[PDB]
Design a protein around this nucleic acid. Structure first.
Ligand SMILES: [K+]
Ligand SMILES: [K+]
Ligand SMILES: [Mg+2]
Ligand SMILES: [Mg+2]
Ligand SMILES: [Mg+2]
Ligand SMILES: [Mg+2]
Ligand SMILES: [Mg+2]
Ligand SMILES: [Mg+2]
Ligand SMILES: [Mg+2]
Ligand SMILES: [Mg+2]
Ligand SMILES: [Mg+2]
Ligand SMILES: [Mg+2]
Ligand SMILES: [Mg+2]
Ligand SMILES: [Mg+2]
Ligand SMILES: [Mg+2]
Ligand SMILES: [Mg+2]
Ligand SMILES: [Mg+2]
Ligand SMILES: [Mg+2]
Ligand SMILES: [Mg+2]
Ligand SMILES: [Mg+2]
Ligand SMILES: [Mg+2]
Ligand SMILES: [Mg+2]
Length: 150
RNA sequence: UGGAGAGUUUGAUCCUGGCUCAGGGUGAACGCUGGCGGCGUGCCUAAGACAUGCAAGUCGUGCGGGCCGCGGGGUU
């Protein structure tokens, strides 16, 4: 019912009297490939707990994507921190052309053909957040004419 | 009908930032190896120096001759 894929898993370290102590963080995307996505970043002393916590947080933070024949309705451009994401719709038969993070996020959203570009900072966390905000700032023609009813 | 990034400054982080890699290309060369054919291509350097052969001539339907040879005439 819900597909789950991890973006990256890292081990951070805090200093304490005696040495360094490690804590694992993990990004996880969840999607039904029908138009709903979810991104989560979980931290835990061990890797499996971090993955499970990231899955929970991802399922808690969902985004409804307005797919239009497997692609996006309009080109977007989002700056999250120093990381820029550029999305652009593509005709079918093109495929998803993106970095690892945006490819995973868009594939779990149900996108089949899209053109992307990462600019500025290539940080996977910030790129993921920028892609999520990009999918969140998507508007359909129905939404546009709904905002201009008056 | 068109756009993917990654490694690397830190104990860990974010940023700035350079370096490097994955791609495509060549009138290429070098190493190891090397079976066939078709089509292309082959002094990028000394516009340095060149043996040798060929590469620009052709018209007797423009004209008069030389040399070699033959035939027929004027003459017993
Ligand atoms: K901003
Ligand atoms: K690192
Ligand atoms: Mg929406
Ligand atoms: Mg900025
Ligand atoms: Mg940069
Ligand atoms: Mg177009
Ligand atoms: Mg068109
Ligand atoms: Mg860099
Ligand atoms: Mg320093
Ligand atoms: Mg170090
Ligand atoms: Mg420090
Ligand atoms: Mg190359
Ligand atoms: Mg190459
Ligand atoms: Mg040989
Ligand atoms: Mg050879
Ligand atoms: Mg040949
Ligand atoms: Mg030849
Ligand atoms: Mg030359
Ligand atoms: Mg050249
Ligand atoms: Mg004439
Ligand atoms: Mg003569
Ligand atoms: Mg005679």
């Amino acid at each position: 019912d819900f597909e789950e894929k991890m973006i990256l898993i890292r081990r951070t370290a805090r200093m304490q009297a005696g040495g360094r102590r490690f804590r694992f963080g993990a990004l996880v995307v969840v999607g039904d490939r029908q138009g709903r996505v979810g991104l989560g970043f979980g931290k835990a002393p061990e890797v499996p707990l971090a993955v499970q916590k990231a899955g929970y947080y991802a399922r808690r933070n969902m985004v409804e994507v307005p797919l239009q024949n497997g692609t996006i309705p309009h080109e977007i451009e989002v700056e999250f921190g120093a990381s820029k994401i550029v999305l652009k719709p593509a005709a079918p038969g093109t495929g998803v052309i993106a970095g690892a993070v945006p490819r995973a996020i868009l594939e779990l959203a149900g996108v089949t053909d899209i053109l992307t570009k990462e600019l500025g900072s290539r940080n996977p966390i910030n790129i993921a957040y920028a892609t999520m905000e990009a999918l969140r700032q998507l508007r359909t023609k129905a939404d546009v004419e709904r905002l201009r009813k008056g």
